[PDB]
Each structure stands twice: as C-alpha cells, then as structure tokens.
Paper text:
The IDO1 active site consists of four sub‐pockets A to D, of which pockets A, B and C are normally separated from pocket D by the cofactor heme. In contrast to inhibitor types I–III, type IV inhibitors do not coordinate to the heme in the IDO1 active site, but target IDO1 exclusively in its heme‐free form.
A co‐crystal structure of apoxidole‐1 with apo‐IDO1 was solved to determine the binding mode of the compound. Residues 360–383 belonging to the JK‐loop are not resolved in this structure, thus indicating a flexible structural element. Consequently, pocket D is in an open conformation and allows for solvent exchange between helices E and F. Furthermore, Leu384 on the N‐terminal side of helix K points into the free heme‐binding pocket as typically observed for structures of apo‐IDO1. The ligand is framed by the hydrophobic amino acids Tyr126, Phe163, Phe214, Phe226, Leu234, Phe270, and Leu342 and is additionally stabilized by polar interactions between the carbonyl oxygen of the ethyl ester of apoxidole‐1 and His346 which is normally coordinated to the proximal site of heme in holo‐IDO1. Similar to other co‐crystal structures, we observed unexplained electron density in close proximity to the tosyl in pocket D. In contrast to the ligand core, the tosyl appendage of apoxidole‐1 is flexible. Hence, we modelled two different conformations of the ligand with the tosyl pointing in different directions (green and cyan sticks). Apoxidole‐1 dose‐dependently reduced the Soret peak, proving that compound binding to IDO1 releases heme.
Author numbering: 3 to 280, 288 to 360, 383 to 400
Write the structure that this text describes.
Amino acid sequence: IQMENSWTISKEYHIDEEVGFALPNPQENLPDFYNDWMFIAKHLPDLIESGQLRERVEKLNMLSIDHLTDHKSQRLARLVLGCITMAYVWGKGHGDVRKVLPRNIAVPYCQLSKKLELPPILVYADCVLANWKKKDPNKPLTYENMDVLFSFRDGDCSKGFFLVSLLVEIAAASAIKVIPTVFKAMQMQERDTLLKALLEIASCLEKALQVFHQIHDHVNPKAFFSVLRIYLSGWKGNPQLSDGLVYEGFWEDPKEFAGGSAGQSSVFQCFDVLLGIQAAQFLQDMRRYMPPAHRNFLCSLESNPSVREFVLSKGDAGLREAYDACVKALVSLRSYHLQIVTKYILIPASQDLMNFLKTVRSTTEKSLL
Ligand SMILES: CCOC(=O)C1=CC[C@](C(=O)OC)(c2cc3ccccc3n2C)N(S(=O)(=O)c2ccc(C)cc2)[C@@H]1C(=O)OC(C)(C)C
C-alpha cells in the first residue's frame, strides 16, 4: 500500500477520506455543449414510458467528448450515457430489445469508457458511486438529505436502491483509513494497536449491515424484480443478446459485458482480501468493472503480509476475538444478503446467484478462527 504520508494512503488510489470509494460531491451538470444528452437522461422515465426514448436517441447528433475536461465531468457523462444505453437496449423491458447501439452515442460512450478504463456498460461506480447529491450541503450524508441524479422508470425504486447501496458503501469504507494501522501494528508487533484496529473494522462492517436494513423502507420487491433489474441487466451470457451488443462505429463485432453484479463493490472485496477470506473467477473478473485506481488498491492490499497468518501465529485470545468479530460481521452481512435476494428476486421470480452467494457465505464462515 502506497502512502501519501505517515498517516494516509496515497491519493493515487482515489479513495476519499469521507466517502471512500464513492465519488466525492459528484458533478450534477455537464457543460452546455452536452445539453441534449442531459435532457434524455433526466427524462428517461417519461421517455421510456411514452415509447419516445429510442427515437430521441436516434436523432442525437454525435457530440465530441473533448469538452469533458476533468474526472468528475467524465464520470457524470459516463453515468448519463450508461443510463441512456440501458434504456435504449432494453426499452420498456418486455422483450423488444435493440442489438445495435447507434453510433451517435456508441462512439462517445466507448471513447469515454476507454479513457476511464471502464467497460462501455453501466457499472456500480456509475449508478451508485457517482449518482448522488446532497440536498443541503451543510447536513450529513443521510437518506433524508440525499437524492440520486438519474432513475430509469417512475416507481423503479432506483433512489432507494442506489442510495441505500451507497450509504452501505460509505459506512463500510470508514474502516479503510484504519488499514495502514493494521499493517504498521503487524510490522511493529503492536498487539493492542492491531486488536483495536480490527475492532474498529468490525464496528464499521456491523454499521454497514444496519444501514442495509433501510432497503425495505425504500425498495419494494416487485418493483425491483420486474423493473429496476431490467436496466441493471447486461449482455454477457444473456440469451436475449447472446453475442453481446454492437457498438456502432466503434467495433464491427458485438461485445459482451456483464451488468450490475455482486462483486463490483470495492470495499467488500477489500475486507475479504484484508482478512484472508479470498465463484473466485467471477469475483476476479468483476474487479475489471471497478475504477482502475480502486483495482490497484485491492492489488496492493493482496501484496501485504497476511493479517490472518499473523493472528494465527500469535496464539492470542484477544486478537482471535477481534479478527473473528470482523469475519462474523461479514457472515452476518452475507446471511442477510441471502435473505434479501430471496425476498427481492427469488420469491418475485416464483410469482444460480443464490448458490454463488451460499458459496461466498460458506467461505466466509470457514474463515472464523
Ligand atoms: C435487492 C438486490 O440487492 C443486491 O443484490 C445488492 C445490493 C447492494 C450491492 C452493494 O454494493 O452493497 C454494498 C450492489 C448494488 C448494485 C447496483 C449496481 C451494480 C452493482 C451493485 N451492487 C454490488 N450489492 S453487494 O455489494 O454485493 C451487498 C449486498 C448485501 C449486503 C448486506 C452487502 C453487500 C448487491 C448486488 O450485487 O446488486 C445486484 C446484483 C447488482 C442486484
């Protein structure tokens, strides 16, 4: 782990001191040059509902990305074009799919994705980590004080789903700043320092689970399953787009990319790595849907000495308990997630993700010392 100074990790990892892997204070407006993109993105609910979306997209002029001159404007553009792309491909979600993304959006979207080293599909870092604003800049980051920037359909519960996910990410990321202390304490054989750091990590993971509970208040299972999940769906292994999507004017052949998926959150991969919990091929591939600087942090973490090995070599009840408090918090999170998928996907579908989630939960449980 590269350090900015004796206390803080390098700014090159683009991890914020307050919101972690989330984008700090995302841009809400693009340069005037891109007004036509912003109009479509801001009106996706009424444009999809009225069947006007695809014709509006097909009438767009091709706009150069050269006027997106900084990271935040580029991230906002990616979010805008990603949401338009999912709306264009899936339409109203009844099977009337489009297999070709028109060049007037495919080319700038793919060029921008190339510049940020992200796939040209909507990812977690777009629709959660960059898709938010504070209502009152002087009040804290709570659901009541926040909004999303874009939604897909009225009633899709995108605000509830995206913001609760974001607040879970922010709660858990509070422990990232303790990570340099973990490794310093191991190198200096500071038992009490390591114990207290692990307890702080456990506390943050426990808080993150309490925040996730808010999902029930702001997301209804039927709306999530039947509507929102449509626009998070990708074109990898998808029988409706079995060869992928044609990005007109960028590649001649169709290309497959996964939609929103488990494993795209950097902060939970980070504590899986830190605690040695590290299905596996799927999670490795999902790192490539993460911003590249966040991948680099995960990779630097994997190159550090093993916390788990340190705790094992010691034979120290307090360290075992503090380590297990972190693992137990992850077990509780994954058990809760299994119940969420049951309520929000399985039961609605009744009226493979689970075997995957059971495998991860079992791996986590088997890491208890
Ligand atoms: C109602 C369905 O609820 C979920 O299944 C998720 C909700 C949140 C989240 C996430 O980031 O939370 C930290 C996620 C939302 C989201 C949106 C777009 C793209 C990626 C996203 N991800 C990863 N995750 S989660 O990390 O694994 C997680 C889950 C539970 C707990 C207790 C902790 C962590 C999953 C998830 O995969 O959503 C998908 C498949 C993409 C539905």
